[PDB]
């Protein structure tokens with residue numbers, strides 16, 4: 001069970017695109033959180049391992065995932081950082097929940113088809 005890079009990209013890139021297509025919900029997630037620009041300096045205290053869609057896309061494009069679960073792990077790290085940091089009434093928190101619902105539905109048949 002060795003996965004070729006283009007096998008992972010062809011299967012998994014569409015699931016990432018489905019997250020980017022969510023508007024407005026993907027908007028806080030398209031680039032790394034920049035705490036200084038956003039006025040949230042406490043972010044680097046609370047979020048030890050940042051992740052976002054641009055980083056995941058670059059890792060798929062450059063062959064940094066060897067197995068599918070490593071990609072799923074990074075998507076879930078992005079979601080967990082956002083639920084950890086943001087208040088339950090906030091846009092980014094509610095938007096994260098939508099992205100998780102979309103991702104759950106996208107990734108399920110994809111994982112089957114990868115073996």
Ligand SMILES: CNC(=O)c1c[nH]c2ccc(N3CCCc4cc(-c5cnn(C)c5)c(C(F)F)cc43)cc12
Pocket residue numbers: 024027028029033038040081082085086091092095
């Ligand atoms: C994973 N993100 C976090 O953990 C963030 C925690 N604090 C934040 C404050 C602002 C933003 N950013 C980033 C830059 C783009 C952006 C765009 C929107 C947006 C939503 N809709 N529109 C029309 C624009 C929002 C907004 F949801 F707050 C937030 C943000 C992200 C976060």
Ligand code: NA
Pocket residue numbers: 014015018
């Ligand atoms: Na699709």
